[PDB]
Amino acid sequence: DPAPATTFAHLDATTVLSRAIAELGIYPAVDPLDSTSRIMDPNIVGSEHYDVARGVQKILQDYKSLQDIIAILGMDELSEEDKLTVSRARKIQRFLSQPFQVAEVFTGHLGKLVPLKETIKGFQQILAGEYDHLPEQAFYMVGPIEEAVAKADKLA
Amino acid sequence: DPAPATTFAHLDATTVLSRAIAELGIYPAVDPLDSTSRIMDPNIVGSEHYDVARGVQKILQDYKSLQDIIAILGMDELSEEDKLTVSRARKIQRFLSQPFQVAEVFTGHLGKLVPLKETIKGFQQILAGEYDHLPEQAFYMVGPIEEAVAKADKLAE
Amino acid sequence: DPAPATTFAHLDATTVLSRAIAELGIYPAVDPLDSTSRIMDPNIVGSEHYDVARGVQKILQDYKSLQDIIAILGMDELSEEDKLTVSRARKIQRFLSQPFQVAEVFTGHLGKLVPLKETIKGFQQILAGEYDHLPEQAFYMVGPIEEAVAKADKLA
Amino acid sequence: VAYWRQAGLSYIRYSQICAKAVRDALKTEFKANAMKTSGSTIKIVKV
Amino acid sequence: ATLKDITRRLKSIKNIQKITKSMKMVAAAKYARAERELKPARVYGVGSLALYEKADIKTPELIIGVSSDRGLCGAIHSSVAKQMKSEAANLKEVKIIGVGDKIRSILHRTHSDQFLVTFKEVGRRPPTFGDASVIALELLNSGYEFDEGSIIFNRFRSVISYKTEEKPIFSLDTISSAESMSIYDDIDADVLRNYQEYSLANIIYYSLK
Amino acid sequence: KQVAGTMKLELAQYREVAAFAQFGSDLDAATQQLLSRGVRLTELLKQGQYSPMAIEEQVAVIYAGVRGYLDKLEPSKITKFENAFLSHVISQHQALLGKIRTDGKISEESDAKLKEIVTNFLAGFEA
Amino acid sequence: KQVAGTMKLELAQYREVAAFAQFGSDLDAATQQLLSRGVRLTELLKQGQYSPMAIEEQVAVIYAGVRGYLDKLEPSKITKFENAFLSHVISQHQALLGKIRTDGKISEESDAKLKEIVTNFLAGFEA
Amino acid sequence: KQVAGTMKLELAQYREVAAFAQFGSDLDAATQQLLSRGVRLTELLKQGQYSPMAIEEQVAVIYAGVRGYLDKLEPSKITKFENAFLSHVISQHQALLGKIRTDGKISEESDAKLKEIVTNFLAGFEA
Amino acid sequence: QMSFTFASPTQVFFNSANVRQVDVPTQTGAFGILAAHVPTLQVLRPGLVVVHAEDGTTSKYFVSSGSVTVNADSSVQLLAEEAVTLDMLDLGAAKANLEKAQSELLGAADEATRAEIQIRIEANEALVKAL
């Protein structure tokens, strides 16, 4: 739509909310592949931060490219390798989710604020496979990585 | 589009070019299922010319109708004959490509000119199965059917 | 589309005529589940009319649901309840047939004007199972329920 | 040792023969099931 | 979103749905028959296994994977293959057999130079003792004096669940000559030869069923 | 009218199953027969340009297929078969064609006459 | 032109066959080789920002791929290889780089020297 | 708030992908339990037209389902239960209903009292 | 009380049934397993199976081959590649069959071939017994 489309040119960072994401229960409903920043540069945020972001977006895009074949046949028909990108991707999609302090009044969950250093790390570990043994639901609506593992435990 | 759409009526032969085909490296990017000629008639070009042309169009429309299905359920569900057409269709699609003399600066290949009889022969043989053992790429960007055989040799080792 | 969308705001019911039903010889070729009416409500046509109607719809639905298990598997495998719902259903779908007067010049058969209370009751008896001892073709192309019982006596 | 052994035959192979014999000695009324069993679909792929 | 493309997609999905609904019904028929013939088979196969659990068998000091040729059955093949690679790794010499082309195409390349035989024509027509006897024969007629083997297959549980399992093949006529087997006397060293051969066909049949 | 209705019905039945043509291994006898009738009735509706047919000619070829005299013939040969067959009956059987006209239908006699031409001509055509 | 001449069409065909092969179909040696070649070249054309390369340097890295020397190197290693290969030739092979740039071509002599450099360097790299 | 909170949570858990029903004794343990409450609670939310309910009657029936008093009933019986339960409380426990209303809260007193009303009624209810 | 299990790949006759005794045809005679018999393993032979039920008038069966097992516990399991009740066997055929076999043998020199014929003879011959 001309209104929004003309607005992109005026921004330094863009956070695009998605209806399909919100319907999956993932809040904030930010589309991780359609949100950009003129600051996402290795010389500005550092190479570790830079590489972890490119990594997350890479696995999300690969999962996206698969979703078409999964829509009909499903996941059970994927190569033992694509099953793996799917798995980590889905865990990453949920780890991007997070309870807000300002929404406490209706969600009933304490809001969370995760420090940038804690954010990079958490995403590194998922990408490196350190949690392939943890269930997806453990990563949904938490703060830092430690809360994911803890939740994966309360799952007894 | 009204411009091109109102133009078909003033022609005797239409050569329709497609982006979907050019994008695949297939040049000239002619759409074999959307190009026509008022002289494509057995009484004018001979039933050999007519039948081969018509045979090429059929194996291609059949593959095209098949494509999206196998892209989902895979190839394994096709019969040995159903998939033998899939492989010849792809070969025929490749034998339609051609290194243009005028295009040397783009293909990096020596231009080629194929006599009518050689065209009919070549397409006829593939349709008949006389090349089911050569690899696809042998048919890509060549002139006469002999070069397909020779490229296949150059590809072996 | 705007045209049919605007028209629907005024319709109180629909009559859907189909080839599929015509090809089964049921005339009129009315689709028994596709055709509907806003006044198909107990508060309007009464509880007796409503209950009988709802019953026919369900049995026609249940019959359509068994089409799978019967096709690939075998009829000699449905449970006694199911086997019976197939006989009542088929009889039901035949009893919805009806010869018209207007077409007496082409059929040679007398048309029928079935009074509502007779209609409500006819099907009520089939659903009740009071005619499970008769052949389907007894309810095909007739008027009142009595005409079903008679057509049955025929010869044998 | 048995005659079939030493002759190269094994026991499964003996059982095979024995089981088939009992089949051929049935009567059409039970001969039907013979087909719904004793298949041979399996195919060797030795390389 | 082009009325052309949209139409192109609808075209191919309406066919998929049609071919896919068909394949479902065919399967449910094959399944129905298979579920039943499986009743006896278990009792029979569990019977064959009644000797070894009822009395120990280990081994001093052959991986058989079963599935089929046809895909489009969720993770039937990937499961056995997954567990098949796992063993070959954790392990003692390694030699393998795959019944059903799919296994020979999956847990393959990495382990071709680790093959003994492979089987085709599995799954279309219902399995038979006869097929099991061919598998057994083909093995006995092999130069692999296996000391111990395992058979990996999918154990049915319900239309919506199965579990990839393993069964030991102490077929080693040699191993069946251990202490625990002292309880059973009046056993010719070669009566076992027949006994083992037989119980080998029974176990392949069971997994197959 | 004598054959049209039947061809109409059989092609309609074919259309519902047509999607299994290249995906029907586990098919049953009936649905497999619908496929074969259809692919063939479909070939009999093909026609070259500038050669409109007399009504007796149209029905003779449609009758053949509808009564299954060509169910075993390979689909790709039907066009050539119809061509050759039509020349033969126009050449050697104007009597037959004449009656289908006059009687205004294919009688028991005409039917007998047709079956014998097509089963023997067909065998020679497949030689 | 000596290294990139037919690469555009070839990469187009590569992407086509790559999509089609995902259908598990059996692949002959010919298509497997095309896939191998395509995936490697795809990596060599990756490039970071703010560091435009001199033409003789692009020619040098293109060469290593188009001539087949990298067909057996794990694709995930191709970027690291290029970075090291390039610093190598720039550090110790200024004469070779300078001749390619000066003649604006790859002479038989320049060709013979590159082969010796890539095969040996590669072997070391894979140590 | 005291009863609809848990109903929301539970009804959600049920909604957490339950298109899978068809299996009964095939599912896990606690998951067949979610389809248990879920279908029951779903039946409680059904209502006819022209018969709006006082909030106090609403919590009474929702209390019944959210506390477990319907788990052992036959899905097709929850409406018969609800209707019978409600006329029983309207007629014999006006006071209790009065207090929940007037207070706008379910006191621990009113709870224990409500516990007894449903327990006894459920007991004498001939499904 | 012994739990007796008797079945073929296709059919099952007994499953953990408390039978008083069973008679089975083995390569070495015809062992009679009793509710309390010493552990043993044996391969079958074309013959007859006799199951003395808990209540007299025993039931008969015919077996082509397979195995039988008696464990430390009073559990027994008989497994025949094929096992049928005499009720479904045509004697007339068997005869016709034993004839042919003995004929082929007279025309075979190949040791292996002979073995395959010999075995067949044995089976068909064993068919006469309860028929």
Ligand SMILES: *N(C(=O)NC1CCCCC1)C1CCCCC1
């Ligand atoms: N060039 C072309 O037609 N001119 C030359 C080609 C070589 C032989 C003499 C004539 C084309 C002009 C349009 C763009 C592509 C090349």
